[PDB]
Design a protein around this ligand. Structure first.
Ligand code: NXL
Ligand code: NXL
Lengths: 241, 242
């Protein structure tokens, strides 16, 4: 591990506070601007769709990435939620109601088991079975996110290979002739401190770079900064052109 | 049901080129092309053959997974990116012929033939060298047949394991953003006339999938970038991508 305080400038520049954590898989070395915050545990929020998807698939609650989840007919704040979805589009548009339903069908007991098996964060499910990742007892740090993601990448989680491959497909965010990004965004709004998350990895020809960032987010105005700042660090470290 | 629409020829004309683009709307089950006749003309698949080759290699265990390393044989070749170690992902990306030759040798004539017949792939003919028949042998496929093949792949309906099909689709990943995902493979038939360039694959949207297959005359390697550029001009035109 290495602290690299120079990255703070990217935060400073956007009048922001937070942490970016980076792991070099070939060299097994981590890098971060803030070793203390990198180990600070927060609510996972919508980053919880990763393990939730995994569990739903492995238990057959979700058959596959094509299965349609019908809108319940209730209009909500985010327009893209008000329509039918599959796993691919539910992940992309971060469709809460679909993931709530997954969680209800999974159930308290099986959800607890799976998180303990995943070694995920503090493994605590206290709260509502369908919102505990948003305002219940579960907490995870950036470094623990990486550790989780590394298992997922290598297909080493205690779920089927197939489930893991489907989720990684659903995490696809960006790809071109230089890199592939698989990742998931999040915004913890109910409990202070309000924070934005971006976690995932960058795939290169020769290596893989895992990432996990969070940043203070008092309003939804700054959301774009999750990606923008992470990329500024990736460019700096010459991981992406 | 197919529709000809000759307006797309302009995109070829504008780059002082000849060829065909074929499009298939999966939701509507309708095809579109600028040239119905060329769309059904069969050509050597060349490097587009890496799709079914990858599939077969995986399904038989010749390739364990997308991470398995294929060591460079130490012979320096024309294309610099081939002169290094590769996995399935990078071998597909940089279209590394020697790796795919080795796969083919290990697969063998008999198993390769059975699999292609089972895939209903092109004319199903393997005549020629077991490791180059897709480049100078007897195998031939049309753009429409490419689509029909790709459609089976997309729906996991080929006669190989689900896992193999998923891995290959992953390896076909070319481009992705917030508007579309493109999974595809390029090709350049150089040994036998007519020299042609290929691009085949599909465009994934939130709500639909658009399959594509194009080929175009390619007397020199100068025009290679036009495979993608022209295809995208049609896709823009039809408002499939922005
Ligand atoms: C997830 O954290 N949420 C669902 C949705 N996600 O958008 S995000 O992934 O860009 O963060 C809106 C924010 C959040 C929520 N309030 O439930
Ligand atoms: C494949 O058709 N080939 C291998 C490599 N691929 O290039 S391409 O995919 O961009 O078309 C070079 C061309 C061709 C060959 N010479 O064998």
């Amino acid at each position: 591990w290495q602290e690299n305080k120079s990255w703070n400038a990217h935060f400073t520049e956007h009048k922001s506070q937070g942490v970016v954590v980076l792991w070099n898989e070939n060299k097994q070395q981590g890098f971060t601007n803030n070793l203390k915050r990198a180990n600070q545990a927060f609510l996972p929020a919508s980053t919880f769709k990763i393990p939730n998807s995994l569990i739903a698939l492995d238990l057959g609650v979700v058959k596959d990435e094509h299965q349609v989840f019908k809108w319940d007919g209730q209009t909500r704040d985010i327009a893209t939620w008000n329509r039918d979805h599959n796993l691919i589009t539910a992940m992309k548009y971060s469709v809460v109601p679909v993931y709530q339903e997954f969680a209800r069908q999974i159930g308290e007991a099986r959800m607890s088991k799976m998180l303990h098996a995943f070694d995920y964060g503090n493994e605590d499910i206290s709260g509502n079975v369908d919102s505990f990742w948003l305002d219940g007892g579960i907490r995870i740090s950036a470094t623990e996110q990486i550790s989780f993601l590394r298992k997922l990448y290598h297909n080493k989680l205690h779920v089927s290979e197939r489930s893991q491959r489907i989720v990684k497909q659903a995490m696809l965010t960006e790809a071109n002739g230089d890199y592939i990004i698989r990742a998931k965004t999040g915004y913890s709004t109910r409990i202070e401190p309000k924070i934005g998350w971006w976690v995932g990895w960058v795939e290169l020809d020769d290596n893989v770079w895992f990432f996990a960032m969070n940043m203070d987010m008092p309003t939804s105005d700054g959301l774009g900064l999750r990606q923008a700042i992470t990329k500024e660090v990736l460019k700096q470290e010459k991981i992406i052109p």
